[PDB]
Amino acid sequence: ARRPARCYRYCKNKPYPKSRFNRGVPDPKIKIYDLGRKRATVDDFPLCVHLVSNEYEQLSSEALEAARICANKYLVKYAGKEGFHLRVRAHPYHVIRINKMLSCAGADRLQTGMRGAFGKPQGTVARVDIGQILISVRTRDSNRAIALEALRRCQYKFPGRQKIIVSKNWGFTPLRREEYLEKKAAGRVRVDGAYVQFLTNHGNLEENMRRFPDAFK
């Protein structure tokens, strides 16, 4: 099986997720989404790069794992197993059907032709839009060249057109590099597991002080 990817490139049907109405869908191909030192603190990795889509198309589950493996090998070899954190931010939830013309309607004739042509599940695919982020990598500042090359190498496994953008934020946080740096000096940022939480001055005064001791001087 495994028809060429040219046959399922355009979003032409309403979303068809697996539910209690369709049963027997095959298990998707990609499982792991986070690789590398996925528990480093926010202060360790201040540089982020993205792989941004530029078409309204469909990305197969098989292609997503192929790009994940390709980028992982290059990063591990040149940056070290502990020098990066890679995250895949596209999840396939759309199920594509197939009409087995000869398996179902061959040999023993049964009914042949286009009569009763509703198909059976065949795979899982992901829907993307223009400007949607596909793969993100965070690392040190001295690894800018390595990160760019790794992303540029893994786009040959995708159909369509993709771009590479160096983000202006700090790590995976939605804050500008300058803004996060000065806010942290004010004591309104507390450490968590690989992420942070922020002071919100809209609760009871008691535990806001212990959670953020440096906010009040």
Binding site: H50, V52, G131, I133, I165, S167, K168, N169
Partner: protein, 158 residues
């Protein structure tokens, strides 16, 4: 393919969010007379005297009054001609309509405003007119100096 009496009414007849429960009791204290203008709005909780899904949202005229229901006349559009329809609706579904209140307000106002002028002796120009184009005026720039704008260069957000 089926065609039942309530088919396709999953969202139409349902009560809203945080609005289930007790019916506000002022509904049963209203009064109706023949010739009034009422509009239909089906309440899901009451299952008796409920009209067909076509009339949910139409406006009609009362023509009969009984112990707990009113008769409404509405006009239905079959292909190429109109037909008069007469339905019986329980009062939990009907409601007085503000469609005609603007007219009834204006006739009372017109009669009194015309009366004073006839005693005084000046034309009124009572009937309404649509919006007219604006008139000439002057705008001063004292302490309101204009600020110059320009398009902004392209920049990447993410």
């Amino acid at each position: 393919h089926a065609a039942g009496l309530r088919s396709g009414t999953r969202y139409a007849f349902s009560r809203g969010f945080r609005k289930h429960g007790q019916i506000p009791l002022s509904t049963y204290l209203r009064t109706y007379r023949v010739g009034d203008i009422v509009d239909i709005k089906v309440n899901g909780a009451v299952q008796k005297g409920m009209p067909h899904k076509f009339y949910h949202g139409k406006t009609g005229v009362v023509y009969n009054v009984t112990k707990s229901a009113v008769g409404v006349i509405v006009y239905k559009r079959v292909k190429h001609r109109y037909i008069e329809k007469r339905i019986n609706v329980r009062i939990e579904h009907v409601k007085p309509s503000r469609s005609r209140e603007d007219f009834l307000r204006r006739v009372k106002e017109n009669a009194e405003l015309k009366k004073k002028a006839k005693a005084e002796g000046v034309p009124v120009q009572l009937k309404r007119q649509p919006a007219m184009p604006r008139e000439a005026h002057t705008v001063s720039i004292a302490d309101n100096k204009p600020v110059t704008l320009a398009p902004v260069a392209y920049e990447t957000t993410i």
